[PDB]
Amino acid sequence: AAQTNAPWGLARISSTSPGTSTYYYDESAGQGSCVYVIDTGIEASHPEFEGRAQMVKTYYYSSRDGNGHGTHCAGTVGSRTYGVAKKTQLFGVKVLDDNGSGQYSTIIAGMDFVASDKNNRNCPKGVVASLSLGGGYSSSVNSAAARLQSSGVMVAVAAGNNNADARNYSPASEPSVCTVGASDRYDRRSSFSNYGSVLDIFGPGTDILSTWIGGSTRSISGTSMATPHVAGLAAYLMTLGKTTAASACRYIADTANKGDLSNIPFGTVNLLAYNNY
Numbered sequence: 001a002a003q004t005n006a007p008w009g010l011a012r013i014s015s016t017s018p019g020t021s022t023y024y025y026d027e028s029a030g031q032g033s034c035v036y037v038i039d040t041g042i043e044a045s046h047p048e049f050e051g052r053a054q055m056v057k058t059y060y061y062s063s064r065d066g067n068g069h070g071t072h073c074a075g076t077v078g079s080r081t082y083g084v085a086k087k088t089q090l091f092g093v094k095v096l097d098d099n100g101s102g103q104y105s106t107i108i109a110g111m112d113f114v115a116s117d118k119n120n121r122n123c124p125k126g127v128v129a130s131l132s133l134g135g136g137y138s139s140s141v142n143s144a145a146a147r148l149q150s151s152g153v154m155v156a157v158a159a160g161n162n163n164a165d166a167r168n169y170s171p172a173s174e175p176s177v178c179t180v181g182a183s184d185r186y187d188r189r190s191s192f193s194n195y196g197s198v199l200d201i202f203g204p205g206t207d208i209l210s211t212w213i214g215g216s217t218r219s220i221s222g223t224s225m226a227t228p229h230v231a232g233l234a235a236y237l238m239t240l241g242k243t244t245a246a247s248a249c250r251y252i253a254d255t256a257n258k259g260d261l262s263n264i265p266f267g268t269v270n271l272l273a274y275n276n277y
Helices: 008-013 069-078 104-120 139-150 223-239 248-255
Strands: 033-039 053-058 089-094 126-131 154-158 178-183 201-204 208-212 216-220
Touching: 008 201, 008 223, 033 069, 033 104, 033 223, 053 104, 069 089, 069 208, 069 216, 069 223, 089 104, 104 126, 104 139, 126 223, 139 154, 154 223, 154 248, 178 223, 178 248, 201 223, 201 248, 208 223, 223 248
Parallel strands: 033 089, 033 126, 053 089, 126 154, 154 178, 178 201
Antiparallel strands: 208 216
């Protein structure tokens, strides 16, 4: 399948080169997979979600996304126009308040929630979790992400936006999950992207168009925007039977575009997520 005039990051994920604007993907499009977006919520009535998004948990007085960040990330995973996996099921877990903040104890509870809640959902092709959030190093946060991965969920986490080594941030620094850095449309490391040996992969993260609250769209930047590209890619590849939740990060790294990015610090992988379609 081909989507013309796609957001640059979708085109990038299906291309060996920067500078094109058509996204190519197998029409299965992540059908039968599920992606949990652990964030500020999802405006599930957005026409772009086509009834495939739903809230499954909140830790606040409402499940509404009063921020936009979670809706944007969910759109990059799975919206019809802005998403990688255009037929996946999206599940929102609101661990962040409408200012985008959340306590680590709430974030941990949300991760353990997903590890159990997937047993209440129909995801025959597999389960992914996208965590566009983080803060300073916490062994308890890393352990929660490790448990979620161990339970059979492909966990993709943002590297962080500190232009620093991700070893000092969580859950970015957890070795067993997929830690995602950000790149721009010219295949440069995004100026804010964290780096270091703990990164597994880069995805598009500068100037990413996606869904927003109020039935709208906008372009924003961050490792938060790169992470859902990788989460959606995992769901897509699992639907194709190419990989599994336990192996998808490694598979994405193995099949990535290699050596294409600039300003990659010595010791950080030079790997850009690629669907090999």
